[PDB]
Every structure is written in structure tokens, then in C-alpha cells.
Design a protein around this ligand. Structure first.
Ligand SMILES: *[C@@]12Nc3cc(C)c(C)cc3N(C[C@H](O)[C@H](O)[C@H](O)COP(=O)(O)O)C1=NC(=O)NC2=O
Ligand SMILES: *[C@@]12Nc3cc(C)c(C)cc3N(C[C@H](O)[C@H](O)[C@H](O)COP(=O)(O)O)C1=NC(=O)NC2=O
Lengths: 133, 133
């Protein structure tokens, strides 16, 4: 195998944003974030941790990605949806969320792992393709 | 923090393909793969592990993504490039590689973490945008 401490060091250092969260009913509470996620969000580790990251949505909460994420998490299936989130400075970015539900048989509670990426460029290009079509 | 054993369990179960590799000169040798990477490649864990994953390129080795990956790994900077890889059955897919170099100060050798995704759909749509333009 691999030393879990080494794997943790690799995850903390990945330029991709990696987050882990635990379920508390309707809400999903974050338990781990990496430095890449801090850079993408602008918020700090203590500021982000131990809450649901729906705060990144802010007032812009009428987004279809929310519902498909909620539906997938309830159905126990992975999902990959793009939402418009806002940084601490107020900058708006398109974030692709790859959320995968995991069940710890020993704990009998549910955790979620998410990998994020600023795909604002891809969204703009596909919008350009749409207006051409 | 978070229990590294739990983080390892979350990584093993992510639907995104996560791999870790160690550097041996020009070659980079894999030390960890997850079940998602097995599904994307079709090859098995024992078949994939402990080798450079350039084998996914096969005869199609005249690809510009190779060089930019090699340049970035040498420069100690992360990279995100798309390459055409081939599964065990011979199926061809466009794989986006997010490779992040990590240096263990204690070990003084270099490891790499990569997150993969079959972006064949995105490549086809951008090709369609190009022929429209
Ligand atoms: C958040 N990324 C993210 C990562 C994980 C691992 C989970 C489980 C969830 C998110 N996420 C979605 C948000 O937390 C809510 O779960 C979602 O809106 C559905 O529930 P709701 O309809 O709010 O009750 C994130 N959303 C974001 O906006 N940005 C992220 O990076
Ligand atoms: C491979 N994904 C991948 C993941 C990591 C963590 C690394 C370090 C490298 C790759 N990778 C690239 C390949 O192994 C070579 O490093 C690359 O071609 C540059 O060196 P070379 O020019 O061959 O000497 C992968 N390539 C793939 O084709 N598919 C993957 O998923």
C-alpha cells in the first residue's frame, strides 16, 4: 500500500482543491480542506472549516446545481455539477464540484469527498459555442 | 485535523481517479491508484502499479501533452494537460491529467499526485466550436 501520512501530505499539497465533509441531516459539514481550496475560495482554513460550504453561493442561491447535488447525495450516487460561487473579495467564479459519497461501515455515518476546479474559461467558451449555434 | 486513515478511505472511494507516483530520474513510478483509476484505465491495480503510466499512451506517443508535462515536472510546477490514452480493451479516451509535484523534505525525494477525468465530451464540443469558427 502507501503510508496514509504520505497520502495526506500529497493531498494537502495538490493544486486541485480537495475537501472532505460529514453529513448532519440536510446539511453537510466540512472537516478537511487543502491549501488549494483556500486559494480558490480566498477564505482561510479556520473560516471555512466546520460548516456547510453553501456559503460560497451567497445570495445567488437560485441555482439548478444545488438541487442535482442534493438529489445525488440523497441517492448515494456521485455527482459533478458547476455552480457560481463568490470569493471573500466578492469575485465570482464558476466552480465544478465532483462530490462522491462515502459510507464508513464502522462509523455508520456518511462522509463526502469533493474535488473543485475553476472552470470559468470552459463555461465562457461553451457560452460562445451556444451563441454561434 | 482529520484521521489520515479516514482521508485514505475517502480517496480510495472517490469517483475521480487519484494516483500518487515517485520520481526515478526521467521516469515517474506509480505507488498508489484508486478504484476510479482502475475503471478509467480498465487495467487492474497489480497491472498498473509500480510503473510509469506512459503505458496508457501506447503507440500514440507523438503528443504535445507529454512535453509540457515533462517540462512542468522538471520545473517543479503543477500542470494540467489532456492526452489521448487507450484502455486495456483498446478503447481510446481523452484524459485530463492534473499533476502536482510534491517534495518530501524528510525523504528528499519527489512525489507526484495526479487527478484524472475522461473529458472526451469536452474535447469533442471544443472541436465542434473550432470548425464553426
Ligand atoms: C461546495 N463543494 C462541496 C463539496 C462537498 C464535499 C459537498 C458534500 C458539498 C459541496 N457543495 C454543495 C453544498 O454544500 C450543498 O450540499 C448543496 O447546495 C446541496 O444542499 P442545499 O441544496 O444547499 O441544502 C458546495 N457548494 C458550493 O457552492 N461550493 C463548493 O465548493
Ligand atoms: C498518466 N497520469 C500521470 C499521473 C502522474 C502523477 C504523473 C507524474 C504522470 C502521469 N502521466 C504522464 C507520464 O507518466 C509521463 O510522465 C509523461 O509522458 C512525461 O514523461 P515522458 O515524456 O513520457 O518521459 C500519465 N500519462 C498518461 O498518458 N496517462 C495518465 O493517466
Amino acid at each position: 500500500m502507501i503510508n496514509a501520512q504520505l497520502l495526506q501530505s500529497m493531498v494537502d499539497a495538490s493544486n486541485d482543491g480537495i475537501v472532505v465533509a460529514e453529513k448532519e441531516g440536510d446539511d453537510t459539514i466540512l472537516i478537511y480542506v487543502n491549501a488549494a481550496f483556500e486559494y480558490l475560495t480566498g477564505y482561510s482554513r479556520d473560516e471555512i472549516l466546520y460548516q456547510d460550504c453553501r456559503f460560497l453561493q451567497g445570495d445567488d442561491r437560485d441555482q439548478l446545481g444545488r438541487a442535482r447535488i442534493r438529489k445525488a447525495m440523497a441517492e448515494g450516487r456521485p455527482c459533478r455539477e458547476v455552480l457560481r460561487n463568490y470569493r471573500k473579495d466578492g469575485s465570482a467564479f464558476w466552480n465544478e464540484l465532483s462530490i462522491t459519497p462515502v459510507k464508513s461501515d464502522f462509523d455508520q455515518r456518511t462522509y463526502f469527498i469533493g474535488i473543485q476546479e475553476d472552470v470559468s474559461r470552459q463555461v465562457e467558451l461553451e457560452r460562445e459555442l451556444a451563441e454561434l449555434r
